[PDB]
Amino acid sequence: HHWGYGKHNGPEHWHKDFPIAKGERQSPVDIDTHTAKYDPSLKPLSVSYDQATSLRILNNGHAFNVEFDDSQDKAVLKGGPLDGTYRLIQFHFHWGSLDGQGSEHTVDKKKYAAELHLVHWNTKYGDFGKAVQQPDGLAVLGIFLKVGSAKPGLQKVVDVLDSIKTKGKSADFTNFDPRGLLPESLDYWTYPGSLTTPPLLECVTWIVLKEPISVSSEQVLKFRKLNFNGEGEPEELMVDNWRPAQPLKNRQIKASFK
């Protein structure tokens, strides 16, 4: 009886195996745009993905992960609210059964169709596993998806999903350029938070871009054809793999923009 997104193992159950689920810096949150304070001390985000080397895509039974070779100093996130340099290890999405839900962060209670997370670890802690034990171990770049025009840079991801339909399936996924998933503007909100799945560790500096990317109805429909279940198990469509907004508690959301 492992955690997942269902009635019997979903977010409202996670606290039993992961008591930090009710902690002081849990993610995601609602971003109240009127209460978020412009912080002129925040720096422009530095997103340097020119040398990003993707290796593989994996269906882990919760989402699909596009994994990167993080063995060298290549794909790095720095500046914005961050001290030092954070290395890209993977990206994944959260999405809905319908276009009206799927994002984890909300903006004045608005839910987007999906949310992209680019996960980076603080190079001062030497690897991903050690970084998640630290309050400044990870920087996750969150990007909203709305349904409209296709995102051409997403299509290589969409086209490989047929080959990883079920939990435990992986596929070679080399030479994927994550710059094709970024919106024009790097205006952002930032706050201290957590992983949004178990183990829910409070190790994340969240950086959530204000500008969504547009993806087509056809692109997101192909996300919704994936399966939570393994090959030769009863079909459970991989939809609604999002955690709802959690209490903000003693936290300030800061805006990079006026």
Ligand SMILES: CC(=O)[C@H]1CC[C@H]2[C@@H]3CC[C@H]4C[C@H](OS(N)(=O)=O)CC[C@]4(C)[C@H]3CC[C@]12C
């Ligand atoms: C058991 C482990 O080795 C830990 C160390 C790093 C952990 C990961 C930390 C990064 C997060 C990001 C991701 O979610 S999110 N939505 O907070 O960006 C899901 C869990 C995952 C992959 C974690 C899975 C458990 C990992 C691999």
Ligand SMILES: [Zn+2]
């Ligand atoms: Zn995520």
